[PDB]
Amino acid sequence: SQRITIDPVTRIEGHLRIDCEIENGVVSKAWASGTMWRGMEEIVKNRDPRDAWMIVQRICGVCTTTHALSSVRAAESALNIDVPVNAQYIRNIILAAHTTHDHIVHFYQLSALDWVDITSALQADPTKASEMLKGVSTWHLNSPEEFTKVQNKIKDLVASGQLGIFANGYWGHPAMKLPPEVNLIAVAHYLQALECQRDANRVVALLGGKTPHIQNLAVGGVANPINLDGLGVLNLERLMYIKSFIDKLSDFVEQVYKVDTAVIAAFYPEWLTRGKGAVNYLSVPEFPTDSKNGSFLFPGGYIENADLSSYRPITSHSDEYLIKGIQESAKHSWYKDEAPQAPWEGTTIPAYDGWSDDGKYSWVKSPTFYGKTVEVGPLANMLVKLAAGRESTQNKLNEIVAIYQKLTGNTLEVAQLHSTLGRIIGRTVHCCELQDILQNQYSALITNIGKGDHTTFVKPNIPATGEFKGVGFLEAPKGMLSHWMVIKDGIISNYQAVVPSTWNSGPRNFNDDVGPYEQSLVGTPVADPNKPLEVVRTIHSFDPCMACAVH
Amino acid sequence: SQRITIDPVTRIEGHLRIDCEIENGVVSKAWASGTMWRGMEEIVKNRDPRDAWMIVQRICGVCTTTHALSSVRAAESALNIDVPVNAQYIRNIILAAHTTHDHIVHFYQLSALDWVDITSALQADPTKASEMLKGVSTWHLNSPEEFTKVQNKIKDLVASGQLGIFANGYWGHPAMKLPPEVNLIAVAHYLQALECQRDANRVVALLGGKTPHIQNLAVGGVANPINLDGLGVLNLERLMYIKSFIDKLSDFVEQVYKVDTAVIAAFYPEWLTRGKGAVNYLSVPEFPTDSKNGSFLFPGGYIENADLSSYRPITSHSDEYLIKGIQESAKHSWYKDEAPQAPWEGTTIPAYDGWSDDGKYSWVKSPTFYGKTVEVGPLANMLVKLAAGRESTQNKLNEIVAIYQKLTGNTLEVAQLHSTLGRIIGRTVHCCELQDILQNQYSALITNIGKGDHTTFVKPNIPATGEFKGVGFLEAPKGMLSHWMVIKDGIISNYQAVVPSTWNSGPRNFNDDVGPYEQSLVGTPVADPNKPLEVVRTIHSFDPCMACAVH
Amino acid sequence: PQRPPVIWIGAQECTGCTESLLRATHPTVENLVLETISLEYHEVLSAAFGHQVEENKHNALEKYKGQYVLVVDGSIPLKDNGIYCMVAGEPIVDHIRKAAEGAAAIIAIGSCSAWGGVAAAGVNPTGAVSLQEVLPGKTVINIPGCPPNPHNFLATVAHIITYGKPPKLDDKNRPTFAYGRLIHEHCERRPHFDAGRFAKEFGDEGHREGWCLYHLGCKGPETYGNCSTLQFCDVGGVWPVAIGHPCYGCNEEGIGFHKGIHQLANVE
Amino acid sequence: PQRPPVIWIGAQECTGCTESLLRATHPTVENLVLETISLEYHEVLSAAFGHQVEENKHNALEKYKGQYVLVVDGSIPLKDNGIYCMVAGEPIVDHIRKAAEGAAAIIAIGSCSAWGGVAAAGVNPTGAVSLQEVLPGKTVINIPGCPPNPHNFLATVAHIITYGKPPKLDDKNRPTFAYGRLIHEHCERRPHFDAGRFAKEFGDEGHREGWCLYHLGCKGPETYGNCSTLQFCDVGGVWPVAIGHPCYGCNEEGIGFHKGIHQLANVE
Numbered sequence A, B: 001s002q003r004i005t006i007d008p009v010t011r012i013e014g015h016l017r018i019d020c021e022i023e024n025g026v027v028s029k030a031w032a033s034g035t036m037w038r039g040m041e042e043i044v045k046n047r048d049p050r051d052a053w054m055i056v057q058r059i060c061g062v063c064t065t066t067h068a069l070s071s072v073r074a075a076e077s078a079l080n081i082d083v084p085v086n087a088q089y090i091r092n093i094i095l096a097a098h099t100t101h102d103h104i105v106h107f108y109q110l111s112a113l114d115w116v117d118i119t120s121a122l123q124a125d126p127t128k129a130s131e132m133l134k135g136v137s138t139w140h141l142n143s144p145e146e147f148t149k150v151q152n153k154i155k156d157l158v159a160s161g162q163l164g165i166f167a168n169g170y171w172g173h174p175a176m177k178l179p180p181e182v183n184l185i186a187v188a189h190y191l192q193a194l195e196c197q198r199d200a201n202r203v204v205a206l207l208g209g210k211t212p213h214i215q216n217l218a219v220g221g222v223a224n225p226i227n228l229d230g231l232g233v234l235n236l237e238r239l240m241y242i243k244s245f246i247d248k249l250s251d252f253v254e255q256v257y258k259v260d261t262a263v264i265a266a267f268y269p270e271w272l273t274r275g276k277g278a279v280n281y282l283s284v285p286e287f288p289t290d291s292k293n294g295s296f297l298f299p300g301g302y303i304e305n306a307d308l309s310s311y312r313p314i315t316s317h318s319d320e321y322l323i324k325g326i327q328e329s330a331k332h333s334w335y336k337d338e339a340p341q342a343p344w345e346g347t348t349i350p351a352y353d354g355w356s357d358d359g360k361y362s363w364v365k366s367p368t369f370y371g372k373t374v375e376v377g378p379l380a381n382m383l384v385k386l387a388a389g390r391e392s393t394q395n396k397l398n399e400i401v402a403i404y405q406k407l408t409g410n411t412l413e414v415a416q417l418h419s420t421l422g423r424i425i426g427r428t429v430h431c432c433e434l435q436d437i438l439q440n441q442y443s444a445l446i447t448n449i450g451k452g453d454h455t456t457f458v459k460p461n462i463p464a465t466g467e468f469k470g471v472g473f474l475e476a477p478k479g480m481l482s483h484w485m486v487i488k489d490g491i492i493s494n495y496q497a498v499v500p501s502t503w504n505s506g507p508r509n510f511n512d513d514v515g516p517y518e519q520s521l522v523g524t525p526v527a528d529p530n531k532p533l534e535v536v537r538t539i540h541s542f543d544p545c546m547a548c549a550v551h
Numbered sequence C, D: 001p002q003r004p005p006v007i008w009i010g011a012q013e014c015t016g017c018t019e020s021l022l023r024a025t026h027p028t029v030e031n032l033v034l035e036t037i038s039l040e041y042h043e044v045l046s047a048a049f050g051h052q053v054e055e056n057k058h059n060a061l062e063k064y065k066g067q068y069v070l071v072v073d074g075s076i077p078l079k080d081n082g083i084y085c086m087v088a089g090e091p092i093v094d095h096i097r098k099a100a101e102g103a104a105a106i107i108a109i110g111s112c113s114a115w116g117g118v119a120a121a122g123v124n125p126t127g128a129v130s131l132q133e134v135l136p137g138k139t140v141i142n143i144p145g146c147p148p149n150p151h152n153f154l155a156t157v158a159h160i161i162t163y164g165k166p167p168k169l170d171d172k173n174r175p176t177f178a179y180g181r182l183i184h185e186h187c188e189r190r191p192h193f194d195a196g197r198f199a200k201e202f203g204d205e206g207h208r209e210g211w212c213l214y215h216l217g218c219k220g221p222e223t224y225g226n227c228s229t230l231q232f233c234d235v236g237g238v239w240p241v242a243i244g245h246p247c248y249g250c251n252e253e254g255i256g257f258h259k260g261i262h263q264l265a266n267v268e
């Protein structure tokens, strides 16, 4: 057996260490470790419930917006507040546009350099590269002339001898399978992606007041003042400007990101057969559209032992079965209290004692659902929507499979989605379906304002005595998020965040069972143990966020 | 034979009527008429000299900036003020960026639909259209996919039955010579041009305070406050933002506009043999770079009888030879005083009496230079630079000729430039050379601020007695512009504008000699006198501006 | 899918009000003409000229009677029987009155058509008047400025299309979302005015720190508009005061084109 | 030509300060890394990981000794001998002190590195401190905000590259072009403050007219920054107060993450 350490894992958010035991060039056992803690649950304690969202938003700036929205939903749950419909439309537009930026950047800026060899791109013929995409995409920026300009920018960076963040990369590795032409196409799309994500964030900015870290929320609704005839407020001119950026996102998403997802699968088909992290999956419904915090545009649910046919739907953020099942343990984490804890009764008492293979090895806690390990995120979200019979999701997956079938002659079955590439496909399907969420909610807001409803905010009252509890659910870019608030004598007496990367990255649990990252790595081939690219490929497919996982 | 009227001429600035006698299928005689007057010279009279530029800027909003800059130069001339060099760099960047917008919009939005048949573009094969440009342009937006998206926009407009401003055009006319594929290329480039001109105007806005109609000038310099370390003023962050837009203009200008100019000439070569308006040409030097209102980046001069070898250089805006030669007559114009007038002694007394072929028929005056008719604008400007031996101008013209040679197997000589297509080529050459002016002047400004010079404004004094005469020259997009101010007892006692479209569009003069628009039309073949497209093609090549011509 | 029709007529215009559309972003001018409206008459962009384009105007006024929005830039000159602006041999006042008969809505874009503007200033050589003066029995929507931000116009047209009526207007028929407040009652340099921190000349130390421009002649205290908030060109931070020059009052009748640049404003 | 080298190390960061660069326009992040600088170490974007990326850090620190700009986001935790942020088996404070020895310039990007920020608030579970506290012999340039506008950072780096020295700084080592004035001393809602025109609750009539946010808890009177003028995202009109929410004081130690959203500011 050999032992390796990967520290730091780069092209993620935050601070992660991965250790592996390797037997005869195959991973036999793995450890995931979050190596940085802040204590954000303790920082927010003993404050007014109204203040929490501005503080806990700073759990993460990659998944900005998400902890802000979960925190106001948690306070509204505790206080029994129904959010105005206009405030829901505005919250929904921000979450959908933010998630579009987040997925694009993950596929291109964070993940592509696991699969793409920039030096190989220098050998490409730009005309042959453009001809490969004929009848496969209708994108307007796949010409030989575009690809030549990109190739020349690579040539100039290499000729300078200053490769910087493109240095000491995995150029020529035996696991790099793309021809030179496909490597050049991918670099061109990497650069083009940066323009599309910028337009998604211009949507977010116009409603949030800036991004990163929006500033338009409140316990009770939003701070945007709706008045079509007002100077200096959210009027028709401002709404038209928002729409101009919404309309700029679809072509890149559909004609570049969707297509590249199918192409990567066509060249790497063994990655349909490895990287399974779990047999149970959870997602929450998202994008409420009624006056009572419900009527979601996207469905949620729980799948057990990979059986889509007998899954359990979740249609409410007040679902008592969902609420009662969630616990976290610190047996193998650096905290004092080890037995599983419901989050309203949670503690976060630091107890660092260094690394032990069989003891404590991470700042991440270990979440369970009625005692089981569960994967969250885009693979869970896609599987639940297929289990629900959602035609939009079926049809989108089928468009990816059709391009894969044109290139390989083969189809994809659902069994092949429980894998590293299935996880990537689920994230692309999500990004595509979010473009119609944007159109739908922009139209709903225009229509509602036209009926005379300009309402945005319900002012809270917070009893000065008594002890009461709330929970705010949200389907974040990395999966199901929950914030858990206890109020006593008008101030926060307990605050616990259970975050999607906590579910996926957490260490061995109270029963010593293995969570998704650690389980996904068993069986990984490693051609060169000094350069374990294959391990990083599977870990990146989960889109790790360690500021989120640990907080 | 018969007599026709074209009223209104469209795809110009302002209100123009053109009359033609046709005999044996060719124009034998023509009349040009400006049909709207405001009296801008009288509106500005009796005011403080410092106020004039904000009023007379409103002579024209197509050539915005130009009358503002000519007016401050005229007051500075009268008062003997030396403008700070930083104020010159800022004025120069504004004029060069504005002129880039102005020429792009002229070639595409105003002139292209004289030469391009939008209906024929529906018959094009997009792949064959993209193949035609291989080895001819490196532009990144010439793909079959781009061209198919544009074709589908035309198909949708036609299918709606609402063609609006694209209706009742000259579709199928015998003078329409492009193949379907080249019509589709041109429509794609028309749409792309709108993005490039928007970037050019972002440069203007960041220094001017808005556009149309800048608001940063003063008699004595500019209103921009230079302070790299100041909040709310022109600091390094604001200068970086200006540079980000300057850098966006070159590729479209070099790879699209310059290439299209050569392609139009290749398909319409007989248009190199008609449309000569004059044998005399004038331009003024432009873009001063010293501390004393001189050291121009572009040269000026006077060509007599088309002889480049014996031209007279003009290197100063104080040149007494230039100043003493300029007069205007109203013999054939709707004003009372008819003898030629030097502009410091000019009058503008309205005397409308209706149209007469041998009497008065326009609101435009008739300018002369030492008693001769003269063409101004891009053809004049190019020919004077070639006479001066300017290698940059030689080289840029040679690039256009080399594309024409590759397409036709024929070359282009200077004699062929005295024509409708030569005029178009001069405009394109100017737009290309202006991109180097922007890079040069941005660099000069950064370097001078770094030497510790932040000066921008010299406060004027205006004596309360005495009579002072000043003249401000400027090389505008349409040609040499001059504003002539007389100051007496501290106020404006006379104000006269002599504008480049006045030179080209003015009617028969005191000696009944014909000006450039009327001369250019003699010999024009007209296949259909009800639909005189051939006449409009030659007139558009001068880029008429009738708000400018008449004021 | 059919697009709402628009007829655009220029009288004594400089073309700056049309050129503002070429800076617009929401919609861009190409999206305006292909997606938002059907532009049935506009001489700056029309393929057809002369008799063909006058045929096209006649046919559109008939086809679309009671449905189209009429837009006018420039003042309308009444002196000497209308001869200071003649198109196809007839005074522009006659073209405008005939188009007004069948209009669903009528907009004066820019200070010239809204109140006479620069072309009616000084001695008023041509007897230039406003669009509302030529059409006394009609409600004219005024969108002043020289030229206005194009979205002050485009969001007015969008309100008519989307919600079936004009935006709320003030007592000068100006949309309140754009003209409802004095510039000085929503200006970022108000703290410096309050503290007596004034630029005295361009390039002086206070000017170079971004202080108030009142003593340079700023007309913000007497001009209604949205120049300090909406600003210009959608780049961020761009309006005359932010660049370093006083407001001249170009929105406001009796201020712009009447008062000197350096003449002081009255403060309420 | 060769490009100026930059080393970027994250401590107790949320990544929002890196993410600000993905909104920038002058330069865009792609032009930053290909044209303006050579980004020699940045874990968010690096192709290399693990042992390879630590070797390339060591090689760059040697090659570029005396020449590189060191940038840090996040607070630095001193409690329990540095163990609350461990990279490659060592406390992050040790990696930062080693990299500081050879730096030509040192920048704390964001409130966390500038003064401790949210991570050092309340009970301060990890004994989080600022970059300047860890490097007492060095001049640290502070660029606060949560996160700042990215150009407050990018124009500081440009001044170093173009003119060979840092921009002018205040007595907290903040660049004057971005932090030299209180938000309330350059706010477009100051006329409303002066007149007693206040929003009382979100969605009320004054809120829906763009009135002053003082009585909602606005911290503009006690916060230095450029949020009202430079604003955010280069689209025009976008900062918290313009969208309808008070300033929280995120730039300023003792205001953001300490005072409640609706707690009133002290006025000078």
Ligand code: SF4
Binding pocket: B058, B061, B212, C012, C013, C014, C015, C016, C017, C073, C074, C109, C110, C111, C112, C113, C117, C118, C145, C146, C147
């Ligand atoms: S309002 Fe101003 S920009 Fe518009 S036509 Fe009149 S002078 Fe020109």
Ligand code: SF4
Binding pocket: C183, C184, C185, C187, C188, C189, C190, C191, C193, C211, C212, C213, C214, C218, C219, C220, C221, C241, C247
């Ligand atoms: S006088 Fe002008 S610059 Fe000063 S506060 Fe008023 S509007 Fe702003």
Ligand code: SF4
Binding pocket: A058, A061, A212, D012, D013, D014, D015, D016, D017, D073, D074, D109, D110, D111, D112, D113, D117, D118, D145, D146, D147
């Ligand atoms: S300053 Fe704010 S955005 Fe930057 S690391 Fe700290 S919490 Fe994140």
Ligand code: SF4
Binding pocket: D183, D184, D187, D188, D189, D190, D191, D193, D211, D212, D213, D214, D218, D219, D220, D221, D241, D247
């Ligand atoms: S309290 Fe806030 S909103 Fe009011 S004027 Fe001051 S900074 Fe502006």
Ligand code: FCO
Binding pocket: A060, A063, A066, A067, A476, A477, A478, A479, A481, A499, A500, A501, A502, A544, A545, A548, A549
């Ligand atoms: N998405 C996201 Fe961040 C993580 N993991 C949260 O919630």
Ligand code: FCO
Binding pocket: B060, B063, B066, B067, B476, B477, B478, B479, B481, B499, B500, B501, B502, B544, B545, B548, B549
């Ligand atoms: N260019 C331009 Fe206008 C005209 N003719 C002026 O001067």
Ligand code: F3S
Binding pocket: C145, C146, C223, C225, C227, C239, C240, C241, C246, C247, C248, C249, C250, C251, C252
């Ligand atoms: S001059 Fe005009 S554009 Fe605005 S700043 Fe003043 S009303």
Ligand code: F3S
Binding pocket: D145, D146, D223, D225, D227, D239, D240, D241, D246, D247, D248, D249, D250, D251, D252
């Ligand atoms: S909360 Fe922060 S981003 Fe600016 S508006 Fe206030 S300093």
Ligand SMILES: [Cl-]
Binding pocket: A226, A227, A228, A229, A449, A454
């Ligand atoms: Cl409303």
Ligand SMILES: [Cl-]
Binding pocket: B226, B227, B228, B229, B449, B454
């Ligand atoms: Cl300076």
Ligand SMILES: [Mg+2]
Binding pocket: A076, A077, A080, A081, A082, A293
């Ligand atoms: Mg509830």
Ligand SMILES: [Mg+2]
Binding pocket: A041, A365, A496, A497, A498, A499, A551
């Ligand atoms: Mg937690």
Ligand SMILES: [Mg+2]
Binding pocket: B457, B458, B459
């Ligand atoms: Mg002086």
Ligand SMILES: [Mg+2]
Binding pocket: B041, B365, B496, B497, B498, B499, B551
């Ligand atoms: Mg004149």
Ligand SMILES: [Mg+2]
Binding pocket: C081, C082
């Ligand atoms: Mg009459």
Ligand code: NI
Binding pocket: A013, A060, A061, A062, A063, A064, A545, A547, A548
């Ligand atoms: Ni996150």
